[PDB]
Amino acid sequence: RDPTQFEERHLKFLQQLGKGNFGSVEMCRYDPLQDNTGEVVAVKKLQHSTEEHLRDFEREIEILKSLQHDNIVKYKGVCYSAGRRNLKLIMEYLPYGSLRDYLQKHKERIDHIKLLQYTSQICKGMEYLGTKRYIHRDLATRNILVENENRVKIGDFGLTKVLPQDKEYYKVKEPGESPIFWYAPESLTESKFSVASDVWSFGVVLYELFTYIEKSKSPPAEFMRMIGNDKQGQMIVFHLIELLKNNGRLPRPDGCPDEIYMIMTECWNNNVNQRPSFRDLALRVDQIRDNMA
Template sequence: MVRKDWASQNSIALSWQEPDFPHGAILDYEIKYYEKEHEQLSYSSTRSKAPSVIITGLKPATKYIFHIRVRTAAGYSGYSQKFEFETGDETSDMAAEQGQILVIATAAVGGFTLLVILTLFFLITGRCQWYIKAKMKSEEKRRAHLQNGDLRFPGVKTYIDPDTYEDPSLAVHEFAKEIDPSRIRIERVIGAGEFGEVCSGRLKTPGKREIPVAIKTLKGGYVDRQRRDFLREASIMGQFDHPNIIRLEGVVTKSRPVMIVVEYMENGSLDSFLRKHDGHFTVIQLVGMLRGIASGMKYLSDMGYVHRDLAARNILVNSNLMCKVSDFGLSRVLEDDPEAAYTTSGGKIPIRWTAPEAIAYRKFSSASDAWSYGIVMWEVMSYGERPYWEMSNQDVILSIEEGYRLPAPMGCPASLHQLMLHCWQKERNHRPKFSDIVSFLDKLIRNPSTLHTLVEDVLVMPDSPGEVPEYPLFVSVSDWLDSIKMGQYKNNFMAAGFTTLDMVSRMSIE
């Protein structure tokens, strides 16, 4: 049986149980697919070493038919039965929510109508007047609860931009607790921030023992604008409550030095931690770290919040290898419109981690955060290597524009590099949402065998960093013919049985 793990407007992720095949070990799987309405016209195919695949370049809100067959040393098996799945559309989520509201509204109207009929019945018969009074009181209570918000549709909290406050200091006091400085004990300096030193220390909690904390301090001689910018991060952090987001303990604003106090992360930033422990972790441990980061980013995205500076240096690691998103200095809020993106003029942009549209037009969105997440994946799987190595920022921008994407680090599972490339699609609407990423990583963790196939087992790596690897996992014969401007010969290739790029590569003059 083939399962649909998730679907976006232009992509579908499929997985299936690896079968017990009597004719030897399974070499790979061939996935044939076509639009349901155009079954007789043409089809595309792709291959996967693992029992899962992400198929991209599909049409929104379209039904597709999928067949899968196995290749062993003895050759190909027959195709499986048909499996039909549909891509999503822009209105699918909205329609689902409207459907739920319609059901609730219908039930409410039906219940109210029944109540009116019962009330009239009792009025006409003159009986059970005590029941009518009790029922009316009960109904008034229910309405009061609804108005007070005790019963409401499920949802998530929405982020509030501190910059929308006329007096930003009000945002600090609304979202962050004021801490008495006598409860803080600074022990040692562990780093330097944009505004001052970062120290480790202890925080005495009321009625509890001391807990380890990190303390950001604002250096002396600051002006009001610097103080406001320093505390802005606390106004942002104080709105978040998630195990994969750094936790704000509170602030000190009524005495000097001004401080932001957060939970202490023993292993520091993820990039330096990985470089220090190069090669020490299993693939499952690395995927677990990536899953934690994706979960934190899903929470931020659900709140309508864009990070803008997602990178391994801004992920902190605790003693349990739990990763938490931090550093909200560059972050901004999204509009309600799902197509909207925050636009800013000026400001430094971390080129190697930033999506092309954000570099070119200063347009940031959750989709540009997804691009950055793909770079973080590459950093994790390469144990903190510098993205694009020694290439200049200008060379990085030009290479990305020409279609270059980072090759997989040595030892990287093919399924993870697939996800990286999916995050690095030029069209931002084609990139996966963080909910999709979390689901995909959960599937890999539940089926560790899918991580055994390494990229170097699937393709020959390019000779130099400047070459773009050819991925038979992604490209169909149809796509290849289009890319060399020979799309008119698709039917000829299919009729001759050349349905995969592997078969095309073995074509001879005969």
């Protein structure tokens, strides 16, 4: 029998874990003996399993399956439905949930040493991803999962794209729901996504971590304040682009160490080529951890 081949009939629903963009994730027990002793897994499925969505979902599955790293959620297998060929992605279940909820829950009880451990781990997952020429496009604390107190993993790849052989960016022609408050200026203006725009988003993740997910301090709350809460729909994007062009930025989180703040601000460079590399960020973060320890 194939362990990566899961029969949907044996999957028992336990609880809902999240909904992002097109897919929904559920906690399920794979219980073929039907006695509640089987493994608990996370199961991602599509809410609207159209032709086009299914095609994109299958590419996402191949992306995750190709990744093997301590800080990337583990692929376990796939479910296939008879007939129209609906797909479910089976992944390891990480019991402490999303980093966003985890931090929002425990707040400052998670100290700076711990936050920088998570930062380094996120950096390393992204650096590895980049070696495969994948662009995440959706790096945010809501897409990072907590395995235990000492380890986080990048947990969703629903927007992930593979770079063309000959280009260092991927251009999205018809944008869907976009996390614009995590987007680099060139992603907003030209829909260009690259390792460097992932670095920009990583700076926003660093901001998220050091604000402890204080709601009034979220990137959407802060950017909306800066452009004016009166701005709506497409005008938000127009004014955000103008703000960023004029070096409008998220503020330093209260109590943030200057060395960490410096990293955020370097990630948020309008000049794409001047943003740091994930290889260098991992080294820099680990050095800061070493100095603190």
